[PDB]
Write a protein that binds this ligand. Structure first.
Ligand SMILES: NC(=O)c1cccc2[nH]ccc12
Length: 167
């Protein structure tokens, strides 16, 4: 049993809810929250900007030190950093950004990072301002992740379309 509440069950391991991931993280304090990161860990907008704002910019300060030491992530890659006030850990995962012309086949590689963690609170990778089709992102998630993933979808309209269209 875990603390996640109000989710619709899609599969054995994937759950979904219409929720603000920031508000969900603040309530649950999950072991892992996933950030929709870019390779520079520049948390300007979308899910990343919202998570970073909720940490009072401490996520960005920590991220800048990580990049100064290690250099940029790979598209499809990830790193584990602090979850600050939101979670124990933040798994920063880089899905391909269609608005930069990145290979959508890298979305499966991105989701494979989730398998290193038993339970996660996450957004749909490459959705929103990353430009991919969220229906596709949910399909890749279900077909790639084996660990228990609780998906937060901010937009109610999109949530209802993801559920209604789910095979
Ligand atoms: N760590 C895993 O890959 C995993 C997690 C939960 C259920 C699973 N079934 C087969 C693999 C697997």
């Amino acid at each position: 049993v875990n603390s996640f509440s109000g989710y619709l069950k899609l599969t054995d391991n994937v759950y979904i809810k219409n929720a603000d991931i920031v508000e969900e993280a603040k309530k649950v304090k999950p072991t892992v929250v996933v950030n929709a990161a870019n390779v520079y860990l520049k948390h300007g907008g979308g899910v990343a900007g919202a998570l970073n704002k909720a940490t009072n910019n401490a996520m960005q300060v920590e991220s800048d030190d990580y990049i100064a030491t290690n250099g940029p992530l790979k598209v499809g890659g990830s790193c584990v950093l602090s979850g600050h006030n939101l979670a124990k850990h933040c798994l920063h995962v880089v899905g391909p950004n269609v608005n930069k012309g990145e290979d959508i086949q890298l979305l499966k590689s991105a989701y494979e990072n989730f398998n290193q963690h038993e339970v996660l609170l996450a957004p749909l990778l490459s959705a929103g301002i990353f430009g991919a089709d969220p229906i596709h992102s949910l399909r890749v998630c279900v077909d790639t992740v084996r660990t228990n993933v609780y998906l937060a979808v901010f937009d109610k309209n999109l949530y209802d379309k993801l559920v209604s269209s789910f095979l």
